[PDB]
Design a protein around this ligand. Sequence first.
Ligand SMILES: Cc1cccc2cccc(/C=C/CC(=O)O)c12
Length: 267
Amino acid sequence: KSFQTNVYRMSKFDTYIFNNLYINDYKMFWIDSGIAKLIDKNCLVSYEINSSSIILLKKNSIQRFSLTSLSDENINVSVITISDSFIRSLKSYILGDLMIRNLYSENKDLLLWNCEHNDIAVLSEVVNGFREINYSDEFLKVFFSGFFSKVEKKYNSIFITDDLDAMEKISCLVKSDITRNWRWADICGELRTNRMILKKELESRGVKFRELINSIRISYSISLMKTGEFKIKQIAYQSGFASVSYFSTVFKSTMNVAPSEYLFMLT
Ligand SMILES: Cc1cccc2cccc(/C=C/CC(=O)O)c12
């Protein structure tokens, strides 16, 4: 209930490409074997990852990156999405060393951690739905809080962001009424904050207002598909779009696949 997991297949030189992918909850992913090339267009860097490389994606970030297989054998990419309720049950473990956390920055939204075998084992059983070694809530809180702490320490940057951060307020507001016809005036009035102030959250992420709203609605539609909802026409309108055609165009530009192709990837 605290984790949502998926496994995707990559064949030889296959490439997943994401543009303006809004991260609605903390995510992490890794490959099970072989070598892959990760190109991060936000940080203008590229590097190779292996079966020990764990990639962390920060909540409320807007991602622009590609992942390419460099291996002959088929690669499985495992993606874990961590629920906000679980993340908040961690706020007592992290923040328990808080004024050392005050000296951190907040630029990095895509982090890399080279882990050992036991980390992969715990994370793999999470993706397996806890069907073999089940874990207690205490073990998982200690494991994940310790994991985030040492990755934050490595980059000297905040990963678990605070609840009163401006982009979190904007995101939670849009997600609480996804079909509302959002405009700048609605955000300013609900947050009682000047547009000169809120616009910094969009500029530092490289998005206009419509692309921000569109990106949140796309990640909303992805959560809907993950529940087993299969009717694309329903998903388009449930996510707040005005037409199936516009939803599919925005989805394709974000995910590089048509909505129906991703829905089948989830099975
Ligand atoms: C994040 C990621 C990383 C690497 C490979 C991937 C392959 C397919 C889909 C996704 C993301 C799917 C949306 C989500 O899970 O919220 C993916």
